[PDB]
Amino acid sequence: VLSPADKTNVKAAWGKVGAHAGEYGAEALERMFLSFPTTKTYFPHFDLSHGSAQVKGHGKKVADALTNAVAHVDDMPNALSALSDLHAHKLRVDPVNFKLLSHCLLVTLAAHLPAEFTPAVHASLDKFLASVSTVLTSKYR
Amino acid sequence: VLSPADKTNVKAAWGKVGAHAGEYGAEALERMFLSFPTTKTYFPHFDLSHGSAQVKGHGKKVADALTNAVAHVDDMPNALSALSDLHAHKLRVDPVNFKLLSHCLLVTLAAHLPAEFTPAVHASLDKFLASVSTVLTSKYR
Amino acid sequence: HLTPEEKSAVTALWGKVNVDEVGGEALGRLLVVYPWTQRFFESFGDLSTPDAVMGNPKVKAHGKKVLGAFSDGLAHLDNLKGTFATLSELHCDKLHVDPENFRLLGNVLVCVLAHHFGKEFTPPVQAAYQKVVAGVANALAHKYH
Amino acid sequence: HLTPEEKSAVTALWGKVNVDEVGGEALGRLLVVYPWTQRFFESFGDLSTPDAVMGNPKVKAHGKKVLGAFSDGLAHLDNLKGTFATLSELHCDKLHVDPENFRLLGNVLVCVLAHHFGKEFTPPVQAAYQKVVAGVANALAHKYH
Ligand code: HEM
Ligand code: HEM
Ligand code: HEM
Ligand code: HEM
Ligand SMILES: CC(C)(Oc1ccc(NC(=O)Nc2cc(Cl)cc(Cl)c2)cc1)C(=O)O
Ligand SMILES: CC(C)(Oc1ccc(NC(=O)Nc2cc(Cl)cc(Cl)c2)cc1)C(=O)O
């Protein structure tokens, strides 16, 4: 479970992200497509090149889900319910992939948060992304 | 994540294990050590040779913990609380190894319970082992 | 890295396999046990229940095709990457199949062999087949880009 | 197998890595972010809090040794297996370290490089390092049995 300290750590990190959440979402997806090419198999309909508006638009949606997850950190299952239906029953992204994107979101945060990305905050964020991931796959079977 | 039908399926299948629990546990572990040699890094203190009393005894502890889990499928976090602590705070087995033992338990049940291992029971047992796995790694961090 | 005895163990058991039955069985169980793998099979008709998935002739037909190619690859255990190159390219470039699906089907196939062969699927036989399903999955993932 | 331009992104970035500092930093983070990894460092003294872990001199010392070996490895990107064979045997037969830990350390190191270097740690540079850290972990896993 997310501890009170984790919840505090996540909120302060995401707090400093602030208005750049969208941008960072898009960067994390780019990082993922390049680091882990198999993740591209979910996107044969997108132009995945650097700067792609489809990646920027998707990145903004991913980031807003996370902003929503942080704002309902005590109540994530419900907040993400529509997204967990959509991944379980339509997109059907293999659960392995959430770990890849989590790592890439963590890297993006690290690369933009020189003060805030302390060992403890890094620990809380990984927990928080594992947790979002878990909720997002909780309806898969 | 465990539906009522999963719970019926698991109880049915595992009820058939019965007095073979010891033996099937031992077999799963042996399947694990031979199929996934990295798992042995957790047992350098054991005689891991075929038929070793250390592996039979351990097999029986794992099987009995599973029987406990089945008998309390509604309240697994509670029933497995001590075991949870032990793996989190002392044994500290990397979580990926639970997938490897689960898959070996599934193979064992498959090779032993041919009338019971229908596709739906297969899916139910897999979900069950994944759920016990999640319980056993609940307190890791 | 299969040993000489592991290869002949693999070959020995496979000679007893009805590929088309085992294929339909394994692909069926894939779609049942890991339902998200159904994403590729919208055109296949009824997948509403375990029985419907197992019964569906298209599931069986595709199962026969995949395990047939798997079977043919067991003649080339020392060049799985080579044997599976063009199919790797196809699954990446046209089919958009996440190579994780190869791993899941690999472990489903192991469950099916264990069910089908019982006692005969011994712990050393399993270990040999695990190296096989790893190798085939890795090989089919190899040309992804 | 890393591409030439991935080799040179790796090389260029590493020229600026203080190996001692980054090593200490990455091992410390491993032990904080994935605390079960502490199971290998029972004799290391105080690991009770993030601050204790990060300032622990034995953690820092060992972190220098580990990343130093990693560093040496970056001169042999075409034969990570041969380069790490002896440490692979050591880590299996003497230390009993589950090779999954190499993967976790790989990913912590990537986060450290990103944190430390910021925007210079571009998505192409990251991609090259991912291949490196998978190669290293694979090579360190290679002689397990
Ligand atoms: C942090 C975890 C994730 C979050 C928060 C997330 C969130 C979202 C959101 C908010 C949407 C848009 C839904 C809508 O249009 O109503 C979406 C769609 C989508 N996601 Fe996920 N997602 C995550 C992980 C993943 C992963 C790992 C993959 C596969 C690599 C993936 C593949 C997709 C695809 C293919 C779409 C549809 C894109 C389109 O065609 O517009 N997602 N996700
Ligand atoms: C199905 C999931 C698992 C269950 C239900 C389970 C259950 C148990 C039980 C009941 C014990 C004995 C506790 C006691 O003596 O009080 C034990 C110990 C232990 N387990 Fe777990 N276990 C599981 C997974 C694993 C995995 C995946 C590994 C590593 C590959 C592992 C490694 C160990 C080790 C090293 C011990 C101590 C054995 C000894 O020295 O006696 N376990 N486990
Ligand atoms: C043992 C591993 C596998 C092998 C050897 C294999 C082999 C094949 C072969 C030989 C084809 C025929 C393509 C053609 O006619 O050119 C094919 C197509 C296809 N495969 Fe795979 N496959 C494997 C696993 C999978 C998995 C796990 C999935 C997804 C769950 C998948 C999805 C597909 C799809 C959707 C097609 C196209 C079918 C069609 O057009 O009707 N394959 N595969
Ligand atoms: C980047 C991959 C890694 C490399 C290249 C590496 C390299 C090394 C080296 C050069 C040594 C010292 C050899 C000697 O004593 O003569 C060592 C020792 C050790 N390593 Fe690894 N290491 C890696 C990852 C890990 C990880 C992730 C862990 C566990 C979380 C681990 C656990 C240990 C332990 C327990 C020792 C013995 C420490 C002691 O003497 O008390 N290593 N490693
Ligand atoms: C029980 C607990 C705490 O275990 C764990 C939680 C997180 C991780 N990290 C990951 O695997 N990272 C990871 C990162 C990449 Cl790029 C690829 C892959 Cl394949 C994995 C490992 C274990 C949990 O699941 O919450
Ligand atoms: C969300 C949901 C349903 O996803 C999943 C649950 C289980 C699995 N099975 C596996 O990983 N098997 C598996 C088997 C082996 Cl030999 C090795 C490894 Cl590395 C993995 C995959 C996805 C869940 O986590 O419960």
Q: How many CA atoms lie within 13 A of A67 on its CB side?
A: 16
The experimental technique behind this entry is X-ray
Q: Which two tokens stand for residue C50?
A: 């375990």
Cβ count near A37 (within 10 Å)? 16
The SS3 of residue B90 is helix
Distance (Å, whole) CA C98 – CA C92: 8
- Exposed, middle or buried, C84 (CB in 10 Å: 0-12/13-18/19+)? buried
What's the resolution in A? 1.7
Tell me how far apart the alpha carbons of residues D17 and D25 are, in angstroms, rounded to a whole number.
Answer: 12
Which uninterrupted H or E stretch holds B63? helix B53-71
- d(CA B141, ligand 5 centre) in Å: 11
Give the list of residues 6+ apart from residue D61 with CB closer than 8 angstroms, or none.
D24
Alpha carbon distances (Å) from D53 to A93, D26, D42: 37, 11, 12
Max CA distance (Å), chain D: 43
Q: Are A39 and A104 in contact (CB under 8 A)?
A: no
CA distance linking residue C49 with residue B123, whole number of Å: 12
How far apart, in Å, are the Cα atoms of A71 and each of A66, A79, A132?
Answer: 8, 9, 13
Q: What is the tally of helices (H) and strands (E) in chain B? A: 7, 0
Cα nearest neighbour of C88 on chain A: A38
C81 annotated binding-site participant? yes
Burial string for D28-50 (b: 16+ CB within 10 Å, else e) reads bbbbbbbbbbbbbbeebeebeeb
Distance CA C55, CA C67 (A): 17
Could you tell me the domains of chain A? 1-141 (1.10.490.10)
- Those residues with Cβ within 8 angstroms of residue B53's Cβ, 6 or more apart along the chain or in another chain: B47
Testing ligand 1's pocket by substitution, the residue of A61, A90, A139 carrying the most ligand atoms inside 8 A of its CB is A61
C-alpha C141/C-alpha C100 separation (Å) is 9
Ligand in closest contact with the CA of C23: 3
Ligand 6 closest atom vs CA B131: 25
Looking at the CA of A97, name the nearest ligand: 1
CATH of domain C1-145: 1.10.490.10
Those of residues 63-82 in B touching chain D at CB distance below 8 A are: none
Contact A103, A29 (CB under 8 A): no
Q: Mutual orientation of helices B119-137 and C19-33 as an angle, nearest 10°?
A: 50
End-to-end Cα distance, chain A: 22
C145 is in an annotated binding site: no
Q: Please tell me the distance from the alpha carbon of residue D81 to that of residue D88, in angstroms, as a whole number.
A: 9
